[PDB]
Amino acid sequence: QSVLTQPPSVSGAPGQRVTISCTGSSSNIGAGYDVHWYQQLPGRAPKLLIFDNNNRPSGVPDRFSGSKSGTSASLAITGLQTEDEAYYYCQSYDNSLILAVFGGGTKVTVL
Amino acid sequence: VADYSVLYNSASFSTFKCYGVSPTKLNDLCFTNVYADSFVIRGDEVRQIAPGQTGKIADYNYKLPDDFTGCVIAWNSNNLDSKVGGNYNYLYRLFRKSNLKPFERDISTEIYQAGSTPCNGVEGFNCYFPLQSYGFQPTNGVGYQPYRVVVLSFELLHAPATVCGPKKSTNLVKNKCVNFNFNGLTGTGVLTESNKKFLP
Amino acid sequence: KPFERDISTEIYQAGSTPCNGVEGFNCYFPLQSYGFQPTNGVGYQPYRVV
Amino acid sequence: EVQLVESGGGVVQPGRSLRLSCAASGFKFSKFAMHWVRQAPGKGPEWVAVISYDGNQYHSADSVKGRFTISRDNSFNTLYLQMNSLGPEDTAVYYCARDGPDTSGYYANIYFDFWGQGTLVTVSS
């Protein structure tokens, strides 16, 4: 089960911006722990996309950005194209249940 | 200007021991310079941070003089310093040939020479790497979870004082014989409005 | 004050939070206890004063 | 390049035990602790267990405790995961992941930077 609550699907069209809002409880994100995002293209294993708050790793276009505030986090896709149709998951850590927790995932759809 | 009352009333620290001064009377005296140092140790070695104690920590890492004055503050920090799979980023000295002098450090990692046969640049037999590594896990016992320690030291001697407690004030009155204490100036009198023009 | 005695052993109050009949935090028993042993140093052996 | 290949999946009847492993290459295997992560078909990923960089310390998820055991061979660059008495809800795709090198603030934050490919494991009759 997904501890972190995430919207089921976000639509869009090429050119504009879309945002994914991953929200957490007091123990997971409200305790000060960071937030991580991966990308799972269809038929492939998930790949790291945004590690730590923003701070993108090597080999990724700068179109992807994200931030965290309060008890929730948000990822933003700038200048969306048609090749971004995949799944995106938000990940963090929990200090009460004592295990890494994942989000429900979002299927970004480009019209 | 310091303010220790908020720290003492935080009610989150599990150890607040002050040697040679009471915490309540810490807001009404001035010092010259205050030394603050900090580190992280196990939950069972916390009792070794005190004047006149023995053990690995007090013998090889941190030593307090017998005429120490100051306060020792510690609090459990299992949520911030321990991770699943073990945390091995905290070290502590375990082999040495003599005890530390009070308020001394050493970060040399020369190979220890145990036994009789000498050695150099190798850790094969009877030659041990001095620094060990704390193994911190969130499921450890209460006596093994890491603790955060902060020690303060004072002198109360010589020099012009530079750090003071938060001396406060009150409201003003007029046309009444009162006991004014404007800064260091004192005395009794009847304060009233004046048209004199002081220089800036 | 000079030539005065006190024998009440009510619990001591330290810090800001009050307490009563408990010794948990910042509330300590006032009276201590001397520890006298025949092998102690000269600075710790008991003395009789009149 | 950091690449991971895993194998040991198959179709099994309930109650039997399996054993799968992944072999790493391209990096010093001894340094990094490693995680096991499974993902049910069509759902979000879930965490399974973790083993330290020398095998002395380990940790497992509460759900799979008492049934899943992980071992490590530092010489042969392989790590092992043992499952006993498979249940009907153990069908998923299992990845073996690598711990994150640098996590910046705090010491409790963990993340996975390199993933394998997965082996389909299903239980039926």
Residue numbers in the entry:
A (entry chain Q): 1 to 111
B (entry chain B): 362 to 561
C (entry chain A): 462 to 511
D (entry chain P): 1 to 125
Publication excerpt:
As the vulnerable sites, we focused on ACE2-binding sites in the receptor-binding domain (namely receptor-binding site, RBS), which have pivotal functions in viral entry into host cells.
NIV-8 was added as a reference antibody that broadly neutralized the variants but did not recognize Y489. As the side chain of S443 was inward-facing, the loss of neutralizing activity by the S443N mutation was likely because of the conformational change in the loop containing S443. NIV-8 escaped by mutations at sites 346, 443–449, and 499, which is consistent with the binding profile of RBD mutants.
